[model samples]
Target: STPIQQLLEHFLRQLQRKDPHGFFAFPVTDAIAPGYSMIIKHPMDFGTMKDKIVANEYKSVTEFKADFKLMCDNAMTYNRPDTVYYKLAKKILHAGFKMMS
Candidate 1:
C-alpha cells in the first residue's frame, strides 16, 4: 500500500479509544502532573502523534511506536502504580502493542 499513513491513522484512533479518560489525548501540563517537565525530558501524547500522522511525519512504524511508548512511559513514570493514569497507560500500552507486534 502506498499510503501507510492510513494504517497509522487507523491505529491512532484505536489507541485513542482505549483512553476513555482522555489522559493521553493531549500534552500533560505541569498543573495537571506537577513536576512533569522536570521528571519527563520528553513528553508525548496522542494529539501530537495525530498531527505527525496528518503531516505524514512518520516514515516507519518504528517512529510511531516510539511516540506511543514515550506517552505510556511518561504516564507510568510520573504517576504512582496505584494511580488510574498509570494503570490505564499500562493497559493501553499492552493493547496497542498487541496490534503492533
Candidate 2:
C-alpha cells in the first residue's frame, strides 16, 4: 500500500486502541465541521506535504509525515487538553511519529 494509506490506517488503529471515549462515534460530517478535521483536511501549512487520502494531496511519504505532525499540532491547539478529541489526536500523532522514527 501507499505510504499515505499506511499512515491513515495506522492513525485509525491507534485511535481505536487508545480511545477511552467514543471519539470516532461522532458523524464524519460533524467531525469535519468546526473544531475537528483540521488535522486531515489542510495540507498546505506543512511545507511540501499534502493530503493523500481524503483530499488526494502529498507527493511523498516524507511529506505525508511532516504534514501529519503539523496536523496533530494544529488539532492540539484547538482541542481542550483533556477532552476526547484532544486525546484522540494525541494518540494518532504519537503513533504516526513513532512510525516515522
Candidate 3:
C-alpha cells in the first residue's frame, strides 16, 4: 500500500460497494443506451477511475471526486429521473460524497 494509491484504492472500494448492480462500473454504450454517445460528451466510469488510480493519473482526492461527479452527472443528464441509471447515479453520487466527508 503506497500512500495516495492506497487511500484512493480503499475509497474506490467503498464507492463501488454502493453500486452493487454494477450499473456505473463500466461505460454506457449506445448499444444499451441509444443516443447516449450523442448526449453525454465526457463519459466517465468506475473502471476508468480505477485505471487512473493504477496509472497515477489522479493526484488528489479532489481529482477523483471530479471524475466521480462527472460520471454521475452524465447519468443524470442522459437518463430520466425515473430510470434505474439515474436513480442509482444519484444514490452513488450522494454516497460517495458522504464517504469523502
Candidate 4:
C-alpha cells in the first residue's frame, strides 16, 4: 500500500514537470476485469519498490518525498511516462476487490 502511494507521488511529480510532456500511457480499463478481484496484466519487477517499503527505508514523508524527488530528477533526464498503467490499475483493482474475493 505504501508502495502504491509512493508510485502515485512519483507519478504526480512527473505530471508537474513540463519537458517530459507525454502522459504515462496506461491501460487501466483493460487491466481491470469485470467483477474480478485481481486484474490481468504482466507483473512488474517490484523487488526494489517492495524492499523499500518493507524496510521502512524512508523515515518520514519528507524523506519519502526526497526519494521521489530524486526519481523525478532522474526521470527528467530521459523522461517518458511509462505507457503502462496496467500495473497500477491491477494494484488498485486487487486492493479494492481482494477482500470481496
Cα-based RMSD of the predictions, in order? 1.5, 6.4, 0.9, 14.5
User: By TM-score, highest first, what's the ranking?
Assistant: 3, 1, 2, 4
Q: Report clashes for each candidate as comma-separated counts.
A: 0, 1, 0, 1
Ranking of candidates on lDDT, top first? 3, 1, 2, 4
RMSD from true fold, candidate 4: 14.5
Position 70, candidate 4: lDDT: 38
lDDT of 1 by residue, 42-84 (tens): 9999999998988889999999999999999988999999999
**Per-candidate local distance difference test:** 0.90, 0.55, 0.92, 0.37
TM-score of each: 0.94, 0.48, 0.95, 0.31
Q: Put down candidate 4 lDDT per residue, 1-101, tens digits, no spaces.
A: 57655654453344334213222222213234242224322222123333555665655555544443333333233323452333333333334233222
Candidate 2 lands at a TM-score of 0.48
Better candidate number, 1 or 4, judged by lDDT:
1
The runs of at least 3 residues in candidate 2 whose Cα sits more than 4 Å from the true structure, single-residue gaps closed, are 1-56
Off by over 4 Å in 3: none
